[PDB]
Amino acid sequence: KGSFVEMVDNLRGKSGQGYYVEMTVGSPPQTLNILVDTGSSNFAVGAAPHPFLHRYYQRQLSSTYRDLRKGVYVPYTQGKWEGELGTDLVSIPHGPNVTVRANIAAITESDKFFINGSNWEGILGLAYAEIARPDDSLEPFFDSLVKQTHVPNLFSLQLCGAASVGGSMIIGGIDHSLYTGSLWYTPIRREWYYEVIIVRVEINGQDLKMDCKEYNYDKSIVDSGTTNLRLPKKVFEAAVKSIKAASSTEKFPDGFWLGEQLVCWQAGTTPWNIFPVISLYLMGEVTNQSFRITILPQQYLRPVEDDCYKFAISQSSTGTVMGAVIMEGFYVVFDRARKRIGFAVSACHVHDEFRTAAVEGPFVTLDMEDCGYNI
Numbered sequence: 001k002g003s004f005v006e007m008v009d010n011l012r013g014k015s016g017q018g019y020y021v022e023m024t025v026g027s028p029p030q031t032l033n034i035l036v037d038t039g040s041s042n043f044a045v046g047a048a049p050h051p052f053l054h055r056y057y058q059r060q061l062s063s064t065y066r067d068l069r070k071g072v073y074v075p076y077t078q079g080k081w082e083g084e085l086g087t088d089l090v091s092i093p094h095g096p097n098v099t100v101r102a103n104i105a106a107i108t109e110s111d112k113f114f115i116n117g118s119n120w121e122g123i124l125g126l127a128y129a130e131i132a133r134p135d136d137s138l139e140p141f142f143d144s145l146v147k148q149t150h151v152p153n154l155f156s157l158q159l160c161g162a163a164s165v166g167g168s169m170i171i172g173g174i175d176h177s178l179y180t181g182s183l184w185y186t187p188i189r190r191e192w193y194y195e196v197i198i199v200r201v202e203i204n205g206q207d208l209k210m211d212c213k214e215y216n217y218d219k220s221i222v223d224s225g226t227t228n229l230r231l232p233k234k235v236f237e238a239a240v241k242s243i244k245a246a247s248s249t250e251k252f253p254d255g256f257w258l259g260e261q262l263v264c265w266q267a268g269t270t271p272w273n274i275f276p277v278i279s280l281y282l283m284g285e286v287t288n289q290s291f292r293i294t295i296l297p298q299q300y301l302r303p304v305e306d307d308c309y310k311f312a313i314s315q316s317s318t319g320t321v322m323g324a325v326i327m328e329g330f331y332v333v334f335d336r337a338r339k340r341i342g343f344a345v346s347a348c349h350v351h352d353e354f355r356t357a358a359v360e361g362p363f364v365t366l367d368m369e370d371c372g373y374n375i
């Protein structure tokens with residue numbers, strides 16, 4: 001049919017290793033698990049043996065394969081792949097009831113890209129052509145979907161926490177059963193990454209009081225393919241200082257704040273109360289209007305196996321990244337048709353005794369124009 005209930009719970013994954021959706025490529029249909037990545041724009045799949053691949057795309061066996069006789073490579077933050085461009089027919093079984101001819105990068109070689117036992121064999125870049133490789137003429141999968149079918153030009157992501165993870169990618173719309181309260185929208189500043197503008201940051205109700213330009217230096221992006229909340233150096237330093245001070249009744253290894261060492265407590269004794277909430281204020285849809293999303297320590301302390309955790313806020317020199325840990329517990333609407341991103345409290349929100357993850361508005365914020373970074 002293509003109705004939204006068919007896409008509820010269509011995502012799986014492992015903590016820190018991305019979320020993936022099932023797809024098929026070719027005729028007969030070949031099934032692969034595909035990482036869902038709002039931080040890139042290339043559709044690429046393993047297409048040759050690799051120690052970490054359980055299966056891969058075999059172009060010889062597909063009668064609808066077409067070679068584009070062109071190479072391609074994509075460098076991500078920690079890994080990269082190269083391969084051969086082609087087109088083929090693509091479907092999402094737990095998706096809309098459609099089949100599109102899409103661009104596909106067949107991965108022949110890679111370095112630190114695939115992850116040992118992640119269960120995915122490819123990546124679906126859902127951001128815009130501007131960051132596609134080799135260049136912005138290689139149409140991204142979602143652009144092809146929208147062009148070739150009646151699927152509306154938007155999708156939404158409900159990434160759920162815990163170890164296995166699950167969630168939903170609603171292709172073509174919004175499923176009202178996956179969130180509560182109001183959707184709050186922030187403009188997509190520019191169509192490349194899903195770029196947005198942070199206008200204020202508060203920690204436990206205390207304004208960081210930095211020039212708002214620091215928050216978006218050199219950009220702020222919403223990125224399901226990145227695990228952590230990643231903050232520019234100056235912001236990261238101020239947030240860490242503030243988070244250290246709030247939790248200074250416990251002792252922490254110094255490698256913990258850099259994201260290397262685990263910290264552990266007796267099962268069920270995690271002192272959540274000493275870790276502050278973080279509020280990120282985002283530019284809204286009307287003049288002088290913003291809204292805020294509030295992050296609980298259960299989002300930025302990632303469980304890894306006594307209860308053990310990694311600090312999931314880290315330093316960046318390439319701007320703010322609102323990664324999976326921020327997106328978890330929110331329903332995120334990538335409303336491309338209207339150049340905006342919506343946030344609402346997810347149905348699978350995180351539980352804290354006395355505190356709640358929230359999306360709240362409206363707020364008044366003057367001079368939000370000034371928060372955007374320019375060279």
Ligand SMILES: CCc1ccc2c(c1)[C@@H](NC[C@@H](O)[C@@H]1Cc3cccc(c3)CCCCCCC(=O)N1)CC1(CCC1)O2
Nearest residue numbers: 016017018037039040075076077078113131223225226318
């Ligand atoms: C166009 C390719 C590209 C290049 C650089 C880049 C990005 C994208 C932005 N998004 C990164 C994600 O695309 C990438 C997806 C991914 C690839 C392979 C494996 C995973 C995730 C799961 C494990 C996490 C790897 C580290 C984060 C990452 O590179 N995610 C994130 C930023 C932009 C600001 C930081 O850097």
